[PDB]
């Protein structure tokens, strides 16, 4: 034939760290500690694991097995399972385009924060700048100062009025135009991800070596730093204080489920693509288990990394760590934590390694994110594509860049929240539900266990079978239903989102999976004979 076989991994450890690097990201750092603190404290550890063992791990492993078995992309694998659901492979693609529209921009901020941290005196320490207002009040200033409703901090001023420049927009209505600085930053980022993907899985298994190992080192440094800070015990106390009355609330369970879903990131085809390039007789059980156990542990220690510093910050101020940790977003890192860094010796150092940590937290996760889609398209359109990989990868990166220009505006953060919570999320959960239903109830869970019996040499236990059959689809179903029944009220930087925000978010969300029902209709209108015979050729693999 013209082309026979696909490529593989250079080393077990390379992809073993690649999947982990993708699982570990920003959200592991700041989302889990916050949601863990406000939902029972240490007592949040109990439902967090239950939603993992019964929900997260089975989806993770089930997703990781199909890829290493069929060795196909996110699109071509459905042709070999359920052709009508092939639209899924396309849907995710569109989804990715939305995600990459904001997920990179965040890193851009860090980058802009990193290139501004080479000064002996950090910009967000003093108030004597070109962006600060008359409200700017800092420390190493007059004592007795008292905070006012309109007063702001130099860190908050630096994030708000300089890098983000969100004061130049009135909301989603008026947000233009684009900031060229963050454009250059996001260009540098879209350049650093290009040379880590364009050669294929060869480089994406080598670049990951740094991006996945650096954050643990940096987290260690920040850990031994924050542990030495006075009054850091308050943050740990607030972090681990058991509130068993929270478990009675049906909300924290859904929060844990969603949280453990998104941290794992199953159902997206990334793990499918990563598993595709691997040994056929290679173990899937141990791989999935270990990686996940890390993604979580890493979240767990990240909690300390944050709360020691926030505890110190509450000690320097006056207590109630919730007050210093009211805002649940990037501001917790770009303002609070940064302001805490500025008031420490060797501040330049602890700033550089921190922002560098953030960037490396993001890239690896962004490497795979594109990697899965690229793999899918190349596997769906083989030999019409792959003529060169750099061409297609470039064609994707540039498109994502133009797709991120909406986010690079002055009112970009608003768009970040809107897209991340009202658009991409429920759609990823939705398509994940569709996959979970499709593999278990159409392809057959028994045949799946037989395939695992072929790869691993033994059929998977009843504990996992009973999870794939009933527990996991209901696990996703619960989250989806919980969101759709009551979407959360969005708020960012003293600005409440318009009532029509949900309409826009749902509009962007639905436009992503317009392809699956119309593709079902496509094959249903294309395949001759009875509709039962067409659905028979649609149910039976090809």
């Amino acid at each position, epitope marked *: 034939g013209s082309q026979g076989e696909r490529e593989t991994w250079g080393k077990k450890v390379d992809f073993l760290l690649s999947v982990i690097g993708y699982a570990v990201d920003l959200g592991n750092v700041w989302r889990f500690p916050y949601i863990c603190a406000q939902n029972g404290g240490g007592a949040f550890l109990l439902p967090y694991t239950i939603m993992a063992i019964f929900g997260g791990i089975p989806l993770f492993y089930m997703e990781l097995a199909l890829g290493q078995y069929h060795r196909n992309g996110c699109i071509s694998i459905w042709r070999k399972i359920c052709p009508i659901f092939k639209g899924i492979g396309y849907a995710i693609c569109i989804i990715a385009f939305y995600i990459a529209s904001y997920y990179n921009t965040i890193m851009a901020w860090a980058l802009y924060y990193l290139i501004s941290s080479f000064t002996d005196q950090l910009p967000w320490t003093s108030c004597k700048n070109s962006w600060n207002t008359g409200n700017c009040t800092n420390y190493f200033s007059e004592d007795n100062i008292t*905070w*006012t*409703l309109h007063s702001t901090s130099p860190a908050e001023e630096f994030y708000t009025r300089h890098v983000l420049q969100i004061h130049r927009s009135k909301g989603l209505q008026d947000l233009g135009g684009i900031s060229w600085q963050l454009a250059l930053c996001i260009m540098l980022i879209f350049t650093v991800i290009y040379f880590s993907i364009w050669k294929g899985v060869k480089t994406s298994g080598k670049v990951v070596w740094v991006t996945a190992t650096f954050p643990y080192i940096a987290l260690s440094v920040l850990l031994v730093r924050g542990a030495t800070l006075p009054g850091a015990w*308050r943050g740990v106390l607030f972090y681990l204080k058991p509130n068993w009355q929270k478990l009675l609330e049906t909300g924290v369970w859904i929060d844990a489920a969603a949280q453990i879903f998104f941290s794992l990131g199953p159902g997206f085809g990334v793990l499918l693509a990563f598993a595709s390039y691997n040994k056929f007789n290679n173990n899937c059980y141990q791989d999935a288990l270990v990686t996940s156990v890390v993604n979580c542990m890493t979240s767990f220690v990240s909690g300390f990394v944050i709360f020691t510093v926030l505890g110190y910050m509450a000690e320097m101020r*006056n*207590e*109630d760590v919730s*007050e210093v940790a009211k805002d649940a977003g990037p501001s917790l890192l770009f303002i609070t934590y940064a302001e805490a860094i500025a008031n420490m010796p060797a501040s330049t150092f602890f700033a550089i390694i921190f922002f560098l940590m953030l960037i490396t937290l993001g890239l690896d996760s962004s490497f795979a994110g594109l990697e899965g889609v690229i793999t899918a398209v190349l596997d769906e359109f083989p030999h019409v594509w792959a003529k060169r990989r750099e061409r297609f990868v470039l064609a994707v990166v540039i498109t994502c860049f133009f797709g991120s220009l909406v986010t690079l505006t002055f009112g970009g953060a608003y768009v970040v929240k809107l897209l991340e919570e009202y658009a991409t999320g429920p759609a990823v959960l939705t398509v994940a539900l569709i996959e979970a239903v499709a593999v278990s109830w159409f392809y057959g869970i028994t045949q799946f266990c037989r395939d695992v019996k072929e790869m691993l040499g033994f059929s998977p236990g009843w504990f996992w079978r009973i999870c794939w059959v009933a527990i996991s689809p209901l696990f996703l179903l619960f989250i989806i239903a919980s969101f759709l029944m009551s979407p959360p009220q969005l708020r960012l930087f003293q600005y409440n989102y318009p009532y029509w925000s949900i309409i826009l978010g749902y509009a962007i969300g639905t436009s992503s999976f317009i392809c699956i029902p119309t593709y079902i209709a496509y094959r249903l209108i294309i395949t001759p004979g009875t509709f039962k015979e067409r659905i028979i050729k649609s149910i039976t693999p090809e």
Partner: antibody
Amino acid sequence: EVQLQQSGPELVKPGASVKISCKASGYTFTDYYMNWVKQSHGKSLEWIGNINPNNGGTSYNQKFKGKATLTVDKSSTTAYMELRSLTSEDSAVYYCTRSPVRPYYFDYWGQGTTLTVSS
Amino acid sequence: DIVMTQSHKFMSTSVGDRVSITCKASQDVSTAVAWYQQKPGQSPKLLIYSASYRYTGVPDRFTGSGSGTDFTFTISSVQAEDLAVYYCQQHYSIPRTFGGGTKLEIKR
């Protein structure tokens, strides 16, 4: 001359509602949180809740959730507190006091408002 | 929530004597304690804020000390017009709670 002038005494039957005003002067009204403290006869002070005059950003106490409702008017720089479902326990002296965001102390108080809930 | 406990509901002192009121909190507070003075028939008046710091328009005879859970409000020279009920209040956690109150009676 920071002065906080409240309304006069109120005698109301149980089950009814009552609104208390709070005219502020001598400072930038949009700069400070406006609070309401309940003091029973012979008892201690009891913080009901605050309100942000800029947008009406209320923050009530769990013990007063559904008991008190705080409003504000920037046009006349005046705060208001409404109490529904009045009982004998509500018969107490209420104050409205100014407070910054940090440190959260009550620098200036009103003269107080004697509430009597009886038929 | 937080429980600010004043064990001594009443304390006796004389004109010119040194009097000190104690305030016990539930958890560690660091330095977030305010002291208010309420004369019979008047509204409370802020005297001390943040453990030791005095507020503007407060005499030098009123001091404040403490760091943690136990706090102390000290008066050096007691005057006849110093007759009032004194309250301590935490200002860190929501909601803001007050102490029981220590009615300072003057002995003569």
